[PDB]
DNA sequence: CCACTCACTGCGGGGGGTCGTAAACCACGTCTTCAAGGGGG
């Protein structure tokens, strides 16, 4: 849903800096979607030794 | 309104008193095999 909203307002917006920021954000979101990693795994609950 | 910096950041060259357990044994002992010797040049 975040990707959908970002795509819509990217198609809507006219400012170029917003376009660059949102294309970076969309790249990150699609990377998470395709890779399979979960976002919450960046917070550690088990620490290896 | 988005232009146009500029400050910013990151990158290379202290007392005592009890308790339980893997150490920590000195007696414990009887077993082994230490065996004195035995005969066939």
Swiss-Prot record:
Superkingdom of the organism of origin: Bacteria
Record note on biotechnological use: Co-administration of salinamide and rifampicin or salinamide and myxopyronin suppresses the emergence of resistance to both antibiotics.
PTM comment text: Acetylated on several lysine residues in the presence of glucose.
Family recorded in the similarity comment: Belongs to the RNA polymerase beta' chain family.
Summary of the function given for this chain in its UniProt record: DNA-dependent RNA polymerase (RNAP) catalyzes the transcription of DNA into RNA using the four ribonucleoside triphosphates as substrates.
Subunit and partners: The RNAP catalytic core consists of 2 alpha, 1 beta, 1 beta' and 1 omega subunit. When a sigma factor is associated with the core the holoenzyme is formed, which can initiate transcription. The rRNA transcription and antitermination complex (rrnTAC) consists of RNAP, NusA, NusB, NusE (rpsJ), NusG, SubB, ribosomal protein S4, DNA and precursor rRNA; S4 is more flexible than other subunits.
Name of the molecule in the record: DNA-directed RNA polymerase subunit beta'
Organism: Escherichia coli (strain K12)
Gene behind this protein: rpoC
Full-protein residues shown: 196 to 244 of 1407
């Amino acid at each position: 849903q975040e990707c959908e909203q970002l795509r819509e307002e990217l198609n809507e917006t006219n400012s170029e800096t917003k376009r660059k920021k949102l294309t970076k954000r969309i790249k990150l979101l699609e990377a998470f979607v395709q890779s399979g990693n979960k976002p919450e795994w960046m917070i550690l609950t088990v620490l290896p030794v």
